[PDB]
Amino acid sequence: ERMCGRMSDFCREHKTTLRYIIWGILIAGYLALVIAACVMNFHRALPLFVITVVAIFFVVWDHLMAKYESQIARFLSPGQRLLDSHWFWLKWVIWGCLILGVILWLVFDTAKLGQQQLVSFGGLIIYTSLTFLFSKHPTKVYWRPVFWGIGLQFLLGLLILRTEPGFMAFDWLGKQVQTFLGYSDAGASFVFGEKYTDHFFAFKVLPIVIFFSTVMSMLYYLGLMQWIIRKVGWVMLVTMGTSPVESVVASGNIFIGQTESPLLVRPYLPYVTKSELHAIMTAGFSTIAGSVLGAYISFGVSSSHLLTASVMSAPAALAISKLFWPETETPKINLKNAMKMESGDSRNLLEAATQGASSSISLVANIAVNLIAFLALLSFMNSALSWLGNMFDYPQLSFEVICSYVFMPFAFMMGVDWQDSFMVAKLIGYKTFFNEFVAYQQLSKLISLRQVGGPKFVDGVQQYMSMRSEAISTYALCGFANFGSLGIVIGGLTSMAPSRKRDITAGAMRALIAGTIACFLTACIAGMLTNTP
Amino acid sequence: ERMCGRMSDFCREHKTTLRYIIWGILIAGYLALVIAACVMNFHRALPLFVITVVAIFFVVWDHLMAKYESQIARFLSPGQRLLDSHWFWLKWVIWGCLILGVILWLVFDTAKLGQQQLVSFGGLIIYTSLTFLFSKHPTKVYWRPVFWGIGLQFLLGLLILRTEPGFMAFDWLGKQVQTFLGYSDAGASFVFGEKYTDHFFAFKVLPIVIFFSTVMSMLYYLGLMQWIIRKVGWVMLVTMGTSPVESVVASGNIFIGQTESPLLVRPYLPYVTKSELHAIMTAGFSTIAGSVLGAYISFGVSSSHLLTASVMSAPAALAISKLFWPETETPKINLKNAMKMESGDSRNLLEAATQGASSSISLVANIAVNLIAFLALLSFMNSALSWLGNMFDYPQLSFEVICSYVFMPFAFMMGVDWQDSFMVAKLIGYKTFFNEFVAYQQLSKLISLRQVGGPKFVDGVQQYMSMRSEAISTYALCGFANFGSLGIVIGGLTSMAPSRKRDITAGAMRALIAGTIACFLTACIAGMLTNTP
Amino acid sequence: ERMCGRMSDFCREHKTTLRYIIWGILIAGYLALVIAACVMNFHRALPLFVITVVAIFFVVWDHLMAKYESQIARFLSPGQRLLDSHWFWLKWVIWGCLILGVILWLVFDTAKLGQQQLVSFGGLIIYTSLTFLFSKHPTKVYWRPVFWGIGLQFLLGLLILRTEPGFMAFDWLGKQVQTFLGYSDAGASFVFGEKYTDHFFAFKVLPIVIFFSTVMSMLYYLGLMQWIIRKVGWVMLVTMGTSPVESVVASGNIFIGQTESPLLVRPYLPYVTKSELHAIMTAGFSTIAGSVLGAYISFGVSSSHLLTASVMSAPAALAISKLFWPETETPKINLKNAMKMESGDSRNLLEAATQGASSSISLVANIAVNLIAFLALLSFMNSALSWLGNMFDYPQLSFEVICSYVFMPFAFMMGVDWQDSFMVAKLIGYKTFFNEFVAYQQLSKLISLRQVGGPKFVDGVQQYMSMRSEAISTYALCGFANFGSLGIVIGGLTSMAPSRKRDITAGAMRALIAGTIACFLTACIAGMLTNTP
Numbered sequence A, B, C: 001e002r003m004c005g006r007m008s009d010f011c012r013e014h015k016t017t018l019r020y021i022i023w024g025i026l027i028a029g030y031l032a033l034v035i036a037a038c039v040m041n042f043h044r045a046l047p048l049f050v051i052t053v054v055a056i057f058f059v060v061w062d063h064l065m066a067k068y069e070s071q072i073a074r075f076l077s078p079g080q081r082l083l084d085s086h087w088f089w090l091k092w093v094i095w096g097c098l099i100l101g102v103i104l105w106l107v108f109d110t111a112k113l114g115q116q117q118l119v120s121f122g123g124l125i126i127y128t129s130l131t132f133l134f135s136k137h138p139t140k141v142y143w144r145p146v147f148w149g150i151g152l153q154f155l156l157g158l159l160i161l162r163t164e165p166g167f168m169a170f171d172w173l174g175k176q177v178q179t180f181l182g183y184s185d186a187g188a189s190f191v192f193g194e195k196y197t198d199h200f201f202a203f204k205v206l207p208i209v210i211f212f213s214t215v216m217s218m219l220y221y222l223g224l225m226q227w228i229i230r231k232v233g234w235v236m237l238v239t240m241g242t243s244p245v246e247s248v249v250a251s252g253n254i255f256i257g258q259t260e261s262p263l264l265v266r267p268y269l270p271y272v273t274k275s276e277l278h279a280i281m282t283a284g285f286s287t288i289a290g291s292v293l294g295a296y297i298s299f300g301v302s303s304s305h306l307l308t309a310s311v312m313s314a315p316a317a318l319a320i321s322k323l324f325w326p327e328t329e330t331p332k333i334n335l336k337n338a339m340k341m342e343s344g345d346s347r348n349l350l351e352a353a354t355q356g357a358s359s360s361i362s363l364v365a366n367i368a369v370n371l372i373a374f375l376a377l378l379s380f381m382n383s384a385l386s387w388l389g390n391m392f393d394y395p396q397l398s399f400e401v402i403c404s405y406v407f408m409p410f411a412f413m414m415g416v417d418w419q420d421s422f423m424v425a426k427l428i429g430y431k432t433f434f435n436e437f438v439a440y441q442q443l444s445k446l447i448s449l450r451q452v453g454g455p456k457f458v459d460g461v462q463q464y465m466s467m468r469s470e471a472i473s474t475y476a477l478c479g480f481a482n483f484g485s486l487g488i489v490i491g492g493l494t495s496m497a498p499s500r501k502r503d504i505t506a507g508a509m510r511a512l513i514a515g516t517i518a519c520f521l522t523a524c525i526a527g528m529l530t531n532t533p
């Protein structure tokens, strides 16, 4: 077999050239396919052409930025020097212009829309003031991140709610995610028979979790997920000035759960300051996981609002964390270390898919068991409360009434009208005490009732609420911040960073509160821009 | 900022006094609410008044006992000294009086009741003698625990079975337990849809286990369950004289499963002697968990008899363990250490509920898999036995037919009549070879047949059996002693105390037999006290 | 007291005699039962009499072989010495005779049958040559385990396929295996209700796996499975010249799953050489457990073909592994140690049954999760492929269409005619990418379409394929080689022998391919001996 050995040696000598040639040939074939499809009918082949164009543009941009970073910085330095020199008066000029513009927008637009939007703006101010008052170090507060976070949220709201392009873009994206979630039905139908719809939750909503986890793992292996994470994290880091580790964690948490978000930066956990740890936990609690987005979309919640709230919850988390537990130490991690994310230990794509699918057994089992236990407890609590209230000739007392009369101020400050604040209060209580899925199931119930068109009031009891209150509740409920999630978080952050355990338990509770406040802040900005039908 | 710190310092300085005043104010407010409810009506509000009064009595008694312990001991000491001084001659008088009393009670009551009751007494003597003969160390036997355990069982049975208020109270307790455990359906309907009734066992009974684990974890956290466990264990420790750790475990096993009961003394498990480990295993095997008690009462099994058997098994299990495997070494665990129980890791109530719910996944999976395997084996064994018995023109041969003749003597000695002894023996075989759920299902079928009415003998076969034999079967079947369940217990304990892996396996097989005989002793006593229809 | 000790001492002294008497009495009772059964009616008792005669014959044979081994070796040695003395020249005569017989058989038999069988023989030659060409160490290959492996495959296929009694015996065995596995359904009807048929896969098919696991655990404890495994493995070890441990594993894999097969030699697993590990992984990938035999016979696949396919894949895996990755170093496992399989530690039969049943939870959960994930990915891929194909006016493009043209040559070489090669290719692709369950489901549909009748081509698409192509596809698909099943194999082997984790992952992929080629070999021979309908 001498000839085989000689050929093997020759291939090893020029393996790189052969690989490059093969990849170029494949790329040429793909481009030929795309151009042929365009030739046959450009109108029908538009989406493929658009995808190809954007991919090529992004690849070229990345290559050019990698090649000429130093030269770009050298070119841009003189303008930075001039601006730094003129800052002493430019800062006053810019702040005055910003205040004038904000006042003009408030007066004109908000007054035109109505009183509720103005109340929402007031509620935003009140939330920021209160979270400032109970801040860990009120004196040692750095105000750049807070204002930049609120500004980013407001700009995202303006782009996505008050503009045709962004609104249509996010509607299309939500429709695509809804269409994508329908493919797990094939596997669920195979495994659980054609009657899997008889037990809707266990046999239809959990397979969605499994499929989304698998595809998420595959994407993380390929490297697209890290690409998007870096792209958003650079924007947040440049504009807000937060530390690289917390910024990357907040960017990554838009797609990942609270427990599996910190793993993006494992090695540097022991070396993070207290503020960065608290910011990590807050960003964990104030956003949801893309894997369970399918479950909420299944139940009739608006996918566009879910996506927009998830996008807007990162600046909110960072701003509220910086305000609540400000930085009083010197960060140790640098940008290069933080941006580098240690990929998983997967040999090939199919090993990644298998690992991702197998990892979700514990997720689904715990989800089901927790739902059973929590709803049984809820029914028992309702029965006991009714029994106790029957003593005073008031057998209607229940968890719902207490939640309605307890969380009313929070729902009102967000800008919900007086009548619907009580229903939003019930939803907020559901989210706070039980996981956010019960609350989203009841929101699905209410939105379905409104869509059916039945009578609004029956026996002096309101049945449904407006579209605006539904949007505000959609924004306010988009988070994992509930008491049950507290312990499971602490353990996780102790597992990765045992040496910091004494610190974690110190801030965990504070982090959870910040999480909810973050959600509320987004809802306020949602409430300030939506108009009354 | 400084003002906030000053206010916090001021609160901290008076933190104890202000906090105590606030909690007392809340308690006084609750008392005022109770008073208001009683004022509104005295019939509807009666149970709340009763529960409040009993709680006040117990808290007052507990605090008074704690404060004045030394005075009580000082007052008690002289009487104990006098009794010890005169015991040398008083012991014979006491023993003679007890023997005279038992003889008089037997010859009057049991002779009036009938011969079958006297056969139960004979069977009790036979079971105790057989336990003594096949004992690990017959020479080194401590007789006080045996006599005291049998006396406690007899006294409890005489108090409950032969007293109408006791019977009524225990029936009411069982009904409350059933109604409370019926709330799991609220969570099971949500998770498994409105069609959860279609797959009865899979989607109704296992949620009961999950919910019971959740509630039990919550109660262990709050510290309520440990209170009753200590109070019940104290009387056993004082009267029988068993060691503190085994008394605590035996008391805990009344309403906790065999798998979870040793967790009460988990820290001290490695230091337990062999005898105490055998007693732990036996006490676990003899008693059933509270979760299954909800299901069984639904099947038609008497509630009063189920509760009485569960309570009576603990003294029987301890007495049989002390007789079967007597202790021959000095214990190394103090009463204060053993009685004290501390929660592992539960930050708040909801973390405790979540952990309690997540701990039951392995339990439910193992239960389901063992049922599938063992019932498939039963079907195969029946088909093979019929095939083999077809050679002799007896195709009726099956598992039940052979078990009927194999286990007849135990049923006969327990007190059951001759004709019904075979019917009871079939159930005893079902319980010994398969979980108790199947045996209780068959017993419920027989109870339903008896209640509906009809011919006693449709043909040579007998349809149903008397009420007394159903009571005796209800007592004799109340245990977890199965061949199939022997494995997981060995798996369960070794995890808590791996260091004792050698010893755990040594005494498991004898612990299973001690549990079965413990069940049979309680059945013998129940058959002694019951009267023929 | 002392008398009991004296009796115990006497019992200890006479324990051997007591055990011998007990077993003699039991055997005599069994023989008396058999005699009575035969006397009463011989026709009814025939199957029991035959089983008794076979059992007693094997017991006597084993006793004679064990006791009189030395004399047998003494009588055999001189003949072996003479054979070795003459072998230097006898070698060429034996080889020439074998080649001449092969040529005469090929001319006289296959040529009469038709072209396709000759092509299948060519395909067998091509597959063996290709395996040799892409070999880890082509220069150092031992050719005994290839020629002998193919010889054993051909001989067994000839006996089973070209003789009616063998075909009928294997069909009967398949029917019995189906009947025996049928009891799992009756055992799972209790747990999953009477409506378990509604969810066919999850509820009917998995309990089959649980029942098979518990049954095989029982048999491993008793020791019949080990007896059969040794008996079969010795035939391979003496003839092919393979090592002991890998021969034992290959012989055990005939009726044991890939995950549970290494447990036979688990204690010696870390010391196995690299080639022995490769042959331990290949032999798993080319055989199906007995649990799926019942399901596949239920689908309508021929039972004789399934059993013959497994038995023939047993030698083929070893032959292909030895040609693919030849052994390069001396093994360190003795035959005596390798053959001995340590019995289960379970105290009694039911403990071992419980352990075996518990072990299967992970397996069933992983099967369900992987099926859901992979079928979802398949649906998404089909949608994407149709979307892409629509651009070129070809909306029919799908996974099946691509597989039909990708895998056609493999189907053609096996002997399938031209038109049916594409249909076989679709099944081959389904089996390679997803588990063989779906491939056999499609094959069952294709069998049923033929059995029902109807037009061969309802349109330009063929509905069903010939019977011979169904037999060839039955042989080709009988394996566990999947891209999704590689992960669990690696996870199991690393867990059993962590020390070798570096090597296992190195040798997994080459094993998977070596699995499929082995299956193809079993098909080629099956294609070579089968006459067209």
Ligand SMILES: CC(C)C(=O)OC[C@H]1O[C@@H](n2ccc(NO)nc2=O)[C@H](O)[C@@H]1O
Residues within 6 Å of the ligand: A205, A209, A256, A257, A258, A259, A289, A290, A291, A292, A295, A367, A435, A436, A437, A438, A480, A485
């Ligand atoms: C998904 C639907 C059916 C649902 O009801 O889920 C309830 C709870 O599931 C937790 N969860 C989920 C995903 C994740 N990472 O992907 N981490 C989590 O913690 C999270 O607390 C939520 O409330």
Ligand SMILES: CC(C)C(=O)OC[C@H]1O[C@@H](n2ccc(NO)nc2=O)[C@H](O)[C@@H]1O
Residues within 6 Å of the ligand: B205, B209, B212, B256, B257, B258, B259, B289, B290, B291, B292, B367, B435, B436, B437, B480, B482, B485
């Ligand atoms: C389906 C259930 C109710 C059942 O039939 O029980 C049979 C076996 O289930 C074990 N078991 C059950 C409940 C429990 N706590 O509620 N702890 C346990 O250990 C126990 O070993 C017994 O043998």
Ligand SMILES: CC(C)C(=O)OC[C@H]1O[C@@H](n2ccc(NO)nc2=O)[C@H](O)[C@@H]1O
Residues within 6 Å of the ligand: C205, C206, C209, C212, C256, C257, C258, C259, C289, C290, C291, C292, C367, C435, C436, C437, C480, C482, C485
């Ligand atoms: C639903 C079941 C019966 C099935 O169709 O199996 C598909 C995949 O499940 C693996 N499997 C299965 C059974 C077993 N022992 O009984 N060992 C295994 O490894 C194996 O990888 C195969 O590909």
